[PDB]
Amino acid sequence: ARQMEALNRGLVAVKTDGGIFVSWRFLGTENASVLFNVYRDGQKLNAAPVKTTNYVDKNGSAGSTYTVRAVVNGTEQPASEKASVWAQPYHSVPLDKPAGGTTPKGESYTYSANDASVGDVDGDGQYELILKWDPSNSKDNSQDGYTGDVLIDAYKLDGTKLWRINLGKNIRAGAHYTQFMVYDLDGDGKAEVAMKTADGTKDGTGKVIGNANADYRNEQGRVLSGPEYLTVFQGSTGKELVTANFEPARGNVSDWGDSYGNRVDRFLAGIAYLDGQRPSLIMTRGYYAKTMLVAYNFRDGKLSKLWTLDSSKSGNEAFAGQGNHNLSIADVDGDGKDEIIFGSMAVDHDGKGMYSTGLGHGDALHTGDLDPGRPGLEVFQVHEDKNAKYGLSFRDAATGKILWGVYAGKDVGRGMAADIDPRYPGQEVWANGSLYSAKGVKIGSGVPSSTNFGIWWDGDLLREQLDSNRIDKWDYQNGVSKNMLTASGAAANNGTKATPTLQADLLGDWREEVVWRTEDSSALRIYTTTIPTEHRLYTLMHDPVYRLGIAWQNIAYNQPPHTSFFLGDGMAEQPKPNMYTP
Ligand SMILES: C[C@@H]1O[C@@H](O)[C@H](O)[C@H](O)[C@H]1O
Ligand SMILES: C[C@@H]1O[C@@H](O)[C@H](O)[C@H](O)[C@H]1O
Ligand SMILES: C[C@@H]1O[C@@H](O)[C@H](O)[C@H](O)[C@H]1O
Ligand SMILES: C[C@@H]1O[C@@H](O)[C@H](O)[C@H](O)[C@H]1O
Numbered sequence: 001a002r003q004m005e006a007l008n009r010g011l012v013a014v015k016t017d018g019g020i021f022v023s024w025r026f027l028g029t030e031n032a033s034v035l036f037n038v039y040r041d042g043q044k045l046n047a048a049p050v051k052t053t054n055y056v057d058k059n060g061s062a063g064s065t066y067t068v069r070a071v072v073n074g075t076e077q078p079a080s081e082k083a084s085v086w087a088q089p090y091h092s093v094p095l096d097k098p099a100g101g102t103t104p105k106g107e108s109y110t111y112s113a114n115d116a117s118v119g120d121v122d123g124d125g126q127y128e129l130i131l132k133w134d135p136s137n138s139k140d141n142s143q144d145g146y147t148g149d150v151l152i153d154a155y156k157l158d159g160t161k162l163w164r165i166n167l168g169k170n171i172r173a174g175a176h177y178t179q180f181m182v183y184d185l186d187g188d189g190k191a192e193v194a195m196k197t198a199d200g201t202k203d204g205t206g207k208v209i210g211n212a213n214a215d216y217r218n219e220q221g222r223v224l225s226g227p228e229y230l231t232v233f234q235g236s237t238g239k240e241l242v243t244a245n246f247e248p249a250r251g252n253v254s255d256w257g258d259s260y261g262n263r264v265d266r267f268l269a270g271i272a273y274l275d276g277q278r279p280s281l282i283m284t285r286g287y288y289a290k291t292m293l294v295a296y297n298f299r300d301g302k303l304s305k306l307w308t309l310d311s312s313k314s315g316n317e318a319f320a321g322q323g324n325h326n327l328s329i330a331d332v333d334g335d336g337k338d339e340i341i342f343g344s345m346a347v348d349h350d351g352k353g354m355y356s357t358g359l360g361h362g363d364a365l366h367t368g369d370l371d372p373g374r375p376g377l378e379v380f381q382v383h384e385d386k387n388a389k390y391g392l393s394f395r396d397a398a399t400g401k402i403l404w405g406v407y408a409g410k411d412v413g414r415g416m417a418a419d420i421d422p423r424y425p426g427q428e429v430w431a432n433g434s435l436y437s438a439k440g441v442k443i444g445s446g447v448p449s450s451t452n453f454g455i456w457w458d459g460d461l462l463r464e465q466l467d468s469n470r471i472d473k474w475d476y477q478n479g480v481s482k483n484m485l486t487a488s489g490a491a492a493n494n495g496t497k498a499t500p501t502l503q504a505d506l507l508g509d510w511r512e513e514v515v516w517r518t519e520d521s522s523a524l525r526i527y528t529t530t531i532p533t534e535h536r537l538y539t540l541m542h543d544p545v546y547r548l549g550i551a552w553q554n555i556a557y558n559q560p561p562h563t564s565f566f567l568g569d570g571m572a573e574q575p576k577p578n579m580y581t582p
């Protein structure tokens, strides 16, 4: 059994024209025989216990409050936490927008709300939002220039700002720099926050790490010298718990494949259950050429290093040049322990390189049960090298064997995987203007109008699409996308990537919520679906691959999360998660 979060009922109630829509979690600790009673202000609404974890109360009002009681072995359990009614289709979390600044070159910049993650920092079973702020002069690794400070905040859903960490002048702003992990690493029931830090990083209590005044910014506005640190911060306070020297260490900038400072600063990170029971922290560096991955534990108040994979070591040459601007984490070989899907290569739970497809770097990656007729997980990936044998590859996750691929002869920058067509079993995949079945059979002539995120939003087991401030649904019979939601007043992030601040099943039933910032970053808006469903599934945060996907969603070029099992049309009934909570 794996350590997973002790979650509350996640009860939510939302005003609609047809009454109050109520939804809640089916928890990983609950059996299939569990049913529910719904109460409005202490009065039961349903004559018989309901199975599905959504309910429409036609008689409810904006002033109503709700509780749910589980019915276990014929006996009603204590009431859930109380839920009030959302007067809007989204819940707003007001933000403390940081003031703008000026760089040493006299350039002004302002802040916008950017990537988020979630963790329960106080252990009450409700997630907090951990938000990264982005200065308007943040930089790709290919670009020279100074950047504003990167700020990381924690908010409760009620709008309480718990803390701000300022990573300081020695941490450059941009997609590929700070990769922040939020997770209960030590198993006490409370999340911590881990990331790369430097001299001058200021914790949530205002304490500066290392050499407070050291300035290692070069004239390119890059930080290519000086110490580098790894810090675990307390989730509730942002206080520094432990700081160690960061590995993978920089060495020489040129070790990584250029001298101007691009390849050296290509970071990814993850949470992986390397021991099959408890989480470990993964920090990576490099992917275009030299590539390193290091694993750590944070347990019993100590940070410990577990292993290193270094492509520059004799025997590891095949593990250079393969990584994406993203990764996945999953138990692919069935031993209960997590492996790392690092673009075109994979790394075992003990840090040993498993395989490389040799197809090289790409920009999108999907690891899940894509072909439910083929035992094991599958990885769908796209490839940037115009001379790659395949521009899109669909492989056995464990062995790396290519099941099918298609030559593109060009950079294929986007690819998606989602069950959008029930006429073909399993998840469809699309890239480079074509849609395919899980078996590689081209379907029709179109593709969905986005190739970004997949989201479970409506009531059916097919997956919808998310891009920018929109949720769309694929009309598979007619081969066209149609809009389901346009979140007016909400904005996506990261320029052409057009990503939400976060997509995750963070409250209510199994459908995924979306967190988008407002245009002016004065608030985050959490949208939860009010489309009824006949289906009950365990909260996705209790799935061992989905939960890990939420932890890495922020990293570099944000990718959508996947479940460890096939969730889609014609799916088998999912088994209870094998888990315990702290
Ligand atoms: C942009 C940058 O922001 C902070 O790190 C400090 O105020 C520093 O002096 C300034 O140069
Ligand atoms: C306010 C504080 O001032 C100095 O100690 C450093 O510049 C540090 O990075 C900054 O956070
Ligand atoms: C400006 C922005 O920066 C990063 O998020 C990505 O490179 C994206 O494609 C670009 O549009
Ligand atoms: C939309 C906007 O685009 C780019 O300029 C930056 O990457 C920023 O972080 C993002 O939110």
Ligand SMILES: [Ca+2]
Binding pocket: 119, 120, 121, 122, 123, 124, 125, 126, 127, 128
């Ligand atoms: Ca909490």
Ligand SMILES: [Ca+2]
Binding pocket: 183, 184, 185, 186, 187, 188, 189, 190, 191, 192
């Ligand atoms: Ca903890």
Ligand SMILES: [Ca+2]
Binding pocket: 330, 331, 332, 333, 334, 335, 336, 337, 338, 339, 349
């Ligand atoms: Ca495994």
Ligand SMILES: [Ca+2]
Binding pocket: 333, 335, 337, 338, 339, 348, 349, 350
């Ligand atoms: Ca293994």
Ligand SMILES: [Ca+2]
Binding pocket: 325, 361, 362, 363, 384
């Ligand atoms: Ca790329």
Ligand SMILES: [Ca+2]
Binding pocket: 369, 370, 371, 372, 373, 374, 375, 376, 377, 378
């Ligand atoms: Ca499979």
Ligand SMILES: [Ca+2]
Binding pocket: 419, 420, 421, 422, 423, 424, 425, 426, 427, 428, 569
């Ligand atoms: Ca399908």
Ligand SMILES: [Ca+2]
Binding pocket: 456, 457, 458, 459, 460, 461, 462, 463, 464
């Ligand atoms: Ca659906």
Ligand SMILES: [Ca+2]
Binding pocket: 504, 505, 506, 507, 508, 509, 510, 511, 512, 513, 528
């Ligand atoms: Ca939900």
Ligand SMILES: [Ca+2]
Binding pocket: 115, 175, 553, 554, 555, 556, 557, 558
């Ligand atoms: Ca990102």
